């Protein structure tokens, strides 16, 4: 409150939260080594109109051969970033490979179809991983002519995302299976022109598209982590197959369907999960939070305070302080007494009083402090009147009681120069 003198009352202050103690990482027990030494390093690579889609699953990916190497020409990721790629577990990663010139890599992005990357290989706009391309001018490029690998440049319309056509159709603007090379009947095929001492844009590149099918199953492909044990009923951290966070885990009462992995609530929050090694536990990720609020007597009569933890049950608070877990971690602070009723939370530094007083300081729900004590409340002077018939009290003497009453009429007349 930026003062030395502090007046009497509950004042709001900072927010407490239990720092997590354990660390729980849970991956499935599937351990295997990926074919990345084969799909990224192969001898035969197809053309663009017959791009190959390899299912890579039930593995543990390294995600380090892609980084500690300058062999790769263009390593541009779209949906993810580089360094934290081995922190996730995917499901059925698919590798899409094809061979183009040095010019078509500029047309490989979400959007920007252009010339060649529209009729031949269409990308989506959301579901993307990383697009990898490296130069192979010393294998495929022959200076006398490599007329082996082809593409298409005449098709009636565009493609949907991840759609492929191999069918060598005798292209014509009105259907019309033709007999080419008749007029207005051309072929859709065309060669590449991979030469040795040609320009950089005419050199062969091998483009590999790593589609990341994000978690449509219990996950198979993972990174090199270490699956640890579970710690229930204690605030820990997370790293599940596709989920991190911070939580208090507990066994559930669910009716969880077998095809399923996540358990979100009525209003879109996680609230329950499925362990990758046959368990279905809830996720109360609010370990504890709230806000402390210091009850003070007023710094002119006393200087002993009492903290009101607001949304707790005085078991996480005592365990959190005696094991030093809270974020407003003090230095001179202990817990001898702990008043807890009236669910507005823990009240460290107070005493129950049966003799209810006139509610100096309003703690939460009913309970009121003073002086420090924490009683409930004296709602007023208790009374009971003799209510028989005809006897009637008339006042006989009186007084005059000039009582003040304060009304504000006009606050501070301000103005703002909104150019300075």
């Amino acid at each position: 409150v930026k003062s030395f003198e502090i007046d009497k009352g509950i004042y709001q202050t900072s927010n407490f939260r239990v720092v997590p103690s354990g660390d729980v990482v849970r991956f499935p027990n599937i351990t295997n080594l990926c074919p990345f030494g084969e799909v990224f390093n192969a001898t035969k690579f197809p053309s663009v109109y017959a791009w190959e889609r390899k299912k890579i699953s039930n593995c543990v990916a390294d995600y380090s051969v892609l980084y500690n190497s300058t062999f790769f020409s263009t390593f541009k990721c779209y949906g993810v970033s580089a360094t934290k790629l081995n922190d996730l577990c995917f499901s059925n990663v698919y590798a899409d490979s094809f061979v183009v010139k040095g010019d078509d890599v500029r047309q490989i992005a979400p959007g920007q179809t252009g010339v060649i990357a529209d009729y031949n290989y269409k990308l989506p706009d959301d579901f993307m991983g990383c697009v990898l391309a490296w130069n192979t001018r010393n294998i495929d490029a022959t200076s006398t002519g490599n007329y082996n690998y082809k593409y298409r440049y005449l098709r009636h319309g565009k493609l949907r995302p991840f759609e492929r056509d191999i069918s060598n159709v005798p292209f014509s603007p009105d259907g019309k299976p033709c007999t080419p090379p008749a007029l207005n009947c051309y072929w859709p095929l065309n060669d590449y022109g991979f030469y040795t001492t040609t320009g950089i844009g005419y050199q062969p590149y091998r483009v590999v598209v790593l589609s990341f099918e994000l978690l449509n199953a219990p996950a198979t492909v993972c990174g090199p982590k270490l699956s640890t044990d579970l710690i229930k009923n204690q605030c820990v951290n997370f790293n599940f197959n596709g989920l991190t966070g911070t939580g208090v885990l507990t066994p559930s009462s669910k009716r969880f369907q077998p095809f399923q992995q996540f358990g979100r609530d009525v209003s879109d929050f996680t609230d329950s999960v499925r362990d990758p090694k046959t368990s279905e536990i809830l996720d109360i990720s609010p370990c504890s939070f709230g806000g402390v609020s210091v009850i003070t007597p007023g710094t002119n009569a006393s200087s002993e305070v009492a903290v009101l933890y607001q949304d707790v049950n005085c078991t996480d608070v005592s365990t959190a302080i005696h094991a030093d877990q809270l974020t407003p971690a003090w230095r001179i602070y202990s817990t001898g007494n702990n008043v807890f009723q009236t669910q507005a939370g823990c009240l460290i530094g107070a005493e129950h009083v049966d003799t209810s007083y006139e509610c100096d300081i309003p703690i939460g729900a009913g309970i009121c402090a003073s002086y420090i004590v924490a009683y409930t409340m004296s709602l007023g002077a208790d009374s009971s009147i003799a209510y028989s018939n005809n006897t009637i009290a008339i006042p006989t003497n009186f007084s005059i009681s000039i009582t003040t009453e304060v009304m504000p009429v006009s606050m501070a007349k301000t103005s703002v120069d909104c150019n300075m």
Binding site: N390, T391, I392, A393, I394, P395, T396, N397, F398, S399, I400, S401, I402, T403, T404, E405, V406, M407, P408, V409, S410, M411, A412, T414, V416, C418
Partner: protein, 156 residues
Amino acid sequence: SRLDKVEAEVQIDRLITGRLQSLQTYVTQQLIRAAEIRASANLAATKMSECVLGQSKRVDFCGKGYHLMSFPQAAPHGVVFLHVTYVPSQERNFTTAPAICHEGKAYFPREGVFVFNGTSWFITQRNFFSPQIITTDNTFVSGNCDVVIGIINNTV
């Protein structure tokens, strides 16, 4: 000092947007405080036109008692009243009759309750104890002597 060109305009747009949101927040919250303070100002004008300029019989509005007088005083950014009230604090225990049956027909007092049947003596006011002698001026003809609860005779 350490900026040159349009990269600077990103920084200045961030600062202008933030300070403009803060100033707009200030203007909105001052406007809400002005609504609350003009509600209190209308209460103050109402109290100064009821309490000060007359005697406002509505209960627990001007003061706490029965509001005998009222005196306005100035204040920094406000007004402070001084409600001269009337608090009666003593109590006796006298008996009553809700009627008087003198000659064979009931007498209700003055609408203006508590006939004083303290052994059938007087008729007083509602608030301050003030006995008056029972005559026909202090009562009126009312029906017959069939609907009473208490009984008083010899209204002379």
